[PDB]
Amino acid sequence: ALTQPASVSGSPGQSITISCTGTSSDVGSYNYVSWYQQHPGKAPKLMIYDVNTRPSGVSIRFSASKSGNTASLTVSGLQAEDEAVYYCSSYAGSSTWVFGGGTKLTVLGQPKAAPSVTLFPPSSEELQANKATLVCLISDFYPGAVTVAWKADSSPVKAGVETTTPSKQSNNKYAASSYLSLTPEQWKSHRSYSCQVTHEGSTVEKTVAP
Amino acid sequence: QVQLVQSGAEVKKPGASVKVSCKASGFTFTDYAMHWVRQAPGQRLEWMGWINAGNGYTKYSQKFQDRLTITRDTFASTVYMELSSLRSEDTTVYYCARDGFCPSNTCSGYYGMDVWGQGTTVTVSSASTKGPSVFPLAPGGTAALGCLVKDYFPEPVTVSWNSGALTSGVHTFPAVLQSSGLYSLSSVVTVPSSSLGTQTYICNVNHKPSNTKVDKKVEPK
Amino acid sequence: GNPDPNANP
Q1: Could you tell me how many CB contacts below 8 A there are between chain A and chain B?
Q2: What domains can you pick out in chain B, each with its CATH number?
Q3: Cβ contacts (< 8 Å) between B65 and chain C: which residues?
Q4: Do B50 and C6 touch (CB under 8 A)?
Q5: What residues of chain B, 3 to 42, have a C-beta less than 8 Å from chain C?
Q6: What string of H, E and C letters represents the secondary structure of chain A?
């Protein structure tokens, strides 16, 4: 895979550049480097082909070049709509093609938002089903990254934890959930369980008890 | 318009095969080549192979050479991908994309995947279809209550509250996939605390792959 | 040297 930075960010109106480093066998050997923009849930769109050619209708804010084994896409006059994952690609010989790992472009500006956390204990119905799930629901945060830690009383718990990727809500903030699976007797054997959610260095904790 | 329309979502067991079609319209089919490219959730595009629509010659990534065939039917303006011996890592979206066919020894201006299909989701799992268990998540200011939709396969499920009458303050969260292969999700609604014990709250769960519908009243304990 | 070869199979 061609090597791209995991992420790049800029403020509205500024320019950013995304690098794509291959080998002399691909980027370094041919003029068939393309760039693709991909918005969530949609197919990629071609933004540059033949190293530096813009396809019809693509904004002049997008331009690209290559030097040696590294290709570079530059996006000028950053706009919120440019937030997407960008991929480079190259011919690799013998009628094969290779993609880069993609770069998430963030446009800075959106206000920060602290998470709301709701923690539910196992229902009596589920306990009777011989199962126990604690459910930690985390919503309305920005930026879209949180870490979750669980505690039985004051002691860390790592077994049985399942946490989702953050997902963008309709209001452009993020949501996630974390589930702790326990046995019914483990649930009843402690005085309390807690879900601790850390977001940009600050931590919220919710606790529930049998 | 110029478009590529792919066949619909597939759910498969390990070791099975899947055959996805891509139907082209709006342009001269045999003037082009068609790639297949796939993408696991949250991960990169991965090139699989391509075919020339006219002469039918193919090239596959060596990663797929043993279990991938790409074929075309000119009269139907359709390309096919068939991926055999499926494994869980084949759970991805599969895309067809148009590219150029060059007759010359120099080919500037031909290449660049300019037209893409809408994608076909393929899920490969050892799990069998199963409907969910639904558990109540019991509750001035506002209170939160919900329902846990546990242990189903495959996606999706839909949740409503009070048969769609309650929409304000509803948040249905994306599902977690457990190591059992089964999914779970939660739906929570935030409500006035003063309404608890007067107003009835029912979550309505529909899992159409198992033909399961569940209604569950959520109440203070 | 051909940076613009025929890529098609």
Answers
A1: 120
A2: 2-126 (no CATH), 127-221 (2.60.40.10)
A3: none
A4: no
A5: 33
A6: CEECCCEEEECCCCCEEEEEECCCCCCCCCCCEEEEEECCCCCCEEEEECCCECCCCCCCCEEEEEECCEEEEEECCCCHHHCEEEEEEEECCCCCEEEECCEEEEECCCCCECCEEEEECCCHHHHHCCCEEEEEEEEEEECCCCEEEEEECCEEECCCEEECCCEECCCCCEEEEEEEEECHHHHHCCCCEEEEEEECCEEEEEEECC
CATH superfamily placement of domain A118-208 = Immunoglobulins (2.60.40.10)
Domain coordinates in residue numbering, chain A? 7-107, 118-208
Q: Do domains A7-107 and A118-208 have the same CATH topology?
A: yes
Q: Is C1 on the interface with B (CB under 8 A)?
A: no
* Residues in A touching C3 (Cβ below 8 Å): 29-31
Q: Is A116 on the interface with B (CB under 8 A)?
A: no
Query: Which CATH architecture fits A7-107?
Result: Sandwich (2.60)
Technique of determination = X-ray
Q: How far is B112 from chain C (nearest CA, A)?
A: 12
